[PDB]
Amino acid sequence: SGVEDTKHYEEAKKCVEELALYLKQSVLSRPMQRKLVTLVHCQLVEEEGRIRAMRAARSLGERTVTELILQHQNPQQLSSNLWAAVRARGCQFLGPAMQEEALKLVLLALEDGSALSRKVLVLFVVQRLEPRFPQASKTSIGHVVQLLYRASCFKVTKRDEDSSLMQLKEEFRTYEALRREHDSQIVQIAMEAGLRIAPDQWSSLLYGDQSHKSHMQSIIDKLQTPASFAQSVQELTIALQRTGDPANLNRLRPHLELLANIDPSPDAPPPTWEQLENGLVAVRTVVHGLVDYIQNHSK
RNA sequence: UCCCUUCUGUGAAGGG
Ligand SMILES: [Ca+2]
Numbered sequence A: 001s002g003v004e005d006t007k008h009y010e011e012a013k014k015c016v017e018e019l020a021l022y023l024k025q026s027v028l029s030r031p032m033q034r035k036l037v038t039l040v041h042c043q044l045v046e047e048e049g050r051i052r053a054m055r056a057a058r059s060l061g062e063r064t065v066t067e068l069i070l071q072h073q074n075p076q077q078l079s080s081n082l083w084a085a086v087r088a089r090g091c092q093f094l095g096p097a098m099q100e101e102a103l104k105l106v107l108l109a110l111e112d113g114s115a116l117s118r119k120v121l122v123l124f125v126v127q128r129l130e131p132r133f134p135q136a137s138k139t140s141i142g143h144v145v146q147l148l149y150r151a152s153c154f155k156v157t158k159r160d161e162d163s164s165l166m167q168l169k170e171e172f173r174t175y176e177a178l179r180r181e182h183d184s185q186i187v188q189i190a191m192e193a194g195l196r197i198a199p200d201q202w203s204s205l206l207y208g209d210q211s212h213k214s215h216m217q218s219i220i221d222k223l224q225t226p227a228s229f230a231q232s233v234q235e236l237t238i239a240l241q242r243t244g245d246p247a248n249l250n251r252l253r254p255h256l257e258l259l260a261n262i263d264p265s266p267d268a269p270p271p272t273w274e275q276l277e278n279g280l281v282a283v284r285t286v287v288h289g290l291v292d293y294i295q296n297h298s299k
Numbered sequence B: 001u002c003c004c005u006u007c008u009g010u011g012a013a014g015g016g
Helices: A003-020 A030-041 A047-071 A078-088 A096-110 A118-129 A138-150 A175-192 A199-207 A213-222 A227-239 A249-260 A273-296
Strands: A154-157 A165-168
Touching: A003 A030, A003 A273, A030 A047, A030 A273, A047 A227, A047 A249, A047 A273, A078 A175, A078 A199, A096 A118, A096 A138, A096 A165, A096 A175, A096 A199, A118 A138, A138 A175, A175 A199, A175 A213, A199 A213, A227 A249, A249 A273
Parallel strands: none
Antiparallel strands: A154 A165
8 A cells, every 4th residue: 555655745746836836926925935935845755855844834824824814904003903902901112212211220120139019119210210201100100010010020029918029030130131021021912912913013113123123033933832823723713704704715724724733843743645645735725725815805 | 002090910990
């Protein structure tokens, strides 16, 4: 029974060659092409080719779900929606300049291991920030602290029938470390609100420039876990009942899911020829589906 | 990115 093997091989290679026609006035987005190139390049004969290709398919299915969601998303209302989410968590981003200055003041207060009550921390920062930023208030600054709180940046030490005492955990006693956990927390709030936001836009939102794209990219990369693919599918699937699904993206669901149940972890077992074929058929289907949606059902 | 108060908040309670 090695004819089955060869025919699986042939069908897989056919799938990849068929998607290769998209390369390349290209219909596909800038990253999607990239992932496609990585997919065309796996040599399926080679075992590193089969496992790589398998995960390249899972990845390409990832980006397909993302892009599809990005259509269903209002670009002008993106930042308003983000900041809306942030304020809904009792947090607030005061803007890049002020936020940087505020975080540094928090650090000025707490890098040497000091423990302060929340009230006193807020007061410290307000008193020192209002001279350069007249806007500053206990309310708004309290919102910045609450953002660091929700980030689990504090060792909080309770005092019976009194205010708690807060210390910066030692791993966060430098501006770099702190600003990373801060920013990462904002990114998470973006994710729980279901918003997709490109690294360039993140650099814009949090820094007022474009020189922080790789940093943000790293944050988004570190937040990535396998389980997200499936629930992102979930998100899209309920976004399609707010639509009635005119383009019938629903037809993609079973392939997307097959792609989702692929294990992307290394040392995960190599695929059988029938898994290789089913996976590459699935990806061929969904990328075609993406292109159909973009070109034929947009605005 | 309405604003401000209060609070021990992975957040609540109220004002303009
Ligand atoms: Ca008391």
